[PDB]
Symmetry: none
Subunit: 321 residues, 2 copies
């Protein structure tokens, strides 16, 4: 079976490279034939992900969570062991899971997966088992592009970011708020109900957990870098949750404006942060999901998000070490 | 190529009026000709032996299928499709098969009929062992009509009062979802809304009375509803209720299991008699150790199930029928 590089309307190109790269089928197709081609074309696929940063596989027989798991298995990347610092996860089969995000009417900001975690995924997979009735795409953007445009537009700001970095403040409830963009409580965050084991697992993850009165918790993280270096592609990337926090960490316990600051406490310039948001939207690519679609994302080069949608919609995921 | 479905004995099974519980079907030891076992051969035999299998489930209440090539969720789904029961209208693994978010492994899940407090509950249930537990983790099952007959015999007055007033179920919900709780789901998620008006309207549709607590949560009161039902297909009364389940298993920071369920008229249940019922369930139950490939078909009108504590790994998928 052949893996054909196919053009789609939404994709962009950077230095002659498509973003995202799109592979489609040209013996009747079957899941085993696909997973077999994946193993056979390992090198080709590694080079494609290396050049593009994300690869969308469209037109293949991935009709269930089990099929998706088999495809993830064919790529052979080591699975990311679950710890904490993420959201209420629900394992479906094997390395595949469903995480409960914010409501369909909301817009999930751009971010790198588990960006504030020490051992974050190098790669992730997204699978559409049930396409959204309307909207619900998973827009993606090249992190190094965002950095380059930011350094070009706001050299001083970028310069200050690499000197002082960023500081993150996030208040947590005891339980999980299904209605919040950042509704995970400290119980689910640290997979514990004991404050001792929590405050410890918290300090380990590199946090300053101070128990709140209403049984919640106020977490503070940083200073930590805002810019990182992709060793495999020799370039710097916008690896931070600045825009995500500044515009999305909003609920009864969190004021977005105070959710993230420069590493030295100094506030961020509202106009520059929103200018960054503008760059993310302009450079992003929002491919409408089709049932069977499997998207492979290199977490070092891409930030993802989610658009509002009308149910039904079901996108499963898988994280790689 | 044909396959024989042989009624086989196992150590754990019991017998009531000459009928095995659960009935156990396995491939034969030495058949002529020797059949090459496969999933497709099994699913074909299931369709071919429809009547025989319906009769078996009818007489026993539950049927364990042991020794067949059910080696994946996909295989299990094919087996569920071969039986042709209508799927119960709604984490989905494949087709009609899913994984149930159960309690932690160290816990003991109480006996219950599936979706017992739901208007349209499943008539039948399928359980499949994809990965056998390292230790324990069986799925004990017991005959509901037997529990009823023993309860009526030991506590006639109590049963008589149950038929008269029935039971009342209480749950104090928080606004958000508590992860560390067997009943931790809040009213926002339970009623899929953050709007109080809509929520209390949806609870009423579900045959529930909702009262908004002062702390931002909610208190629901379901009932009075019957504690005893009638199995039309078998002409007998069954212990179709979550009495023991709620009285001993619905505990968290907001809920006290002793007020979680009461008589339909508010009167508390006698602790002695409830624990006596718990005793009966344990004595009458059958806990068959799970084996990879096992498929258990349960008639939800005649059987209550549970789960023993266990040491991971363990993986049992499920499927519900209209
Ligand atoms: Fe994400
Ligand atoms: Fe159950």
């Amino acid at each position: 079976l052949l893996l054909v590089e196919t053009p789609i309307p939404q994709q962009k190109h950077y230095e002659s490279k498509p973003f995202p790269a799109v592979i489609s089928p040209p013996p009747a197709l079957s899941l085993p034939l696909f997973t077999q081609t994946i193993k056979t074309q390992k090198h080709y696929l590694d080079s494609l992900l290396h050049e593009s940063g994300a690869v969308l596989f469209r037109g293949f027989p991935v009709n269930s969570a089990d099929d998706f798991n088999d495809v993830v298995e064919a790529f052979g990347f080591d699975e990311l062991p679950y710890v904490g610092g993420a959201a209420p996860r629900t394992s479906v089969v094997g390395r595949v899971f469903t995480a409960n995000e914010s409501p369909p009417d909301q817009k999930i900001p751009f971010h790198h997966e588990m960006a504030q975690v020490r051992e974050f995924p190098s790669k992730l997979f997204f699978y559409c088992e049930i396409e959204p009735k309307c909207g619900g795409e998973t827009p993606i953007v090249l992190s190094h592009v965002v950095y380059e445009r930011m350094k070009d537009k706001h050299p001083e700001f970028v310069q200050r970011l690499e000197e002082h970095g960023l500081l993150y403040v996030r208040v947590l409830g005891e339980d999980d708020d299904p209605s919040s963009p950042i509704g995970r409580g400290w119980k689910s965050t640290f997979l514990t109900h004991d404050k001792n084991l929590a405050e410890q697992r918290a300090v380990d993850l590199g946090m300053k957990l101070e128990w709140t009165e209403d049984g919640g918790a106020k977490t503070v993280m940083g200073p930590i870098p805002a810019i990182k270096y992709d060793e495999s592609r020799n370039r710097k990337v916008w690896f931070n949750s600045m825009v995500a926090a500044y515009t999305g960490w909003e609920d009864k316990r969190n004021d977005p404006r105070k959710a993230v600051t420069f590493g030295d406490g100094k506030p961020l310039p509202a106009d520059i942060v929103h200018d960054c948001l503008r760059i993310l939207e302009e450079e992003c690519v929002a491919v409408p999901w089709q049932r069977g679609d499997v998207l492979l994302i290199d977490n070092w080069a891409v930030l993802h998000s989610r658009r509002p949608f009308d149910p039904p919609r079901r996108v499963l995921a898988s994280l790689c070490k």
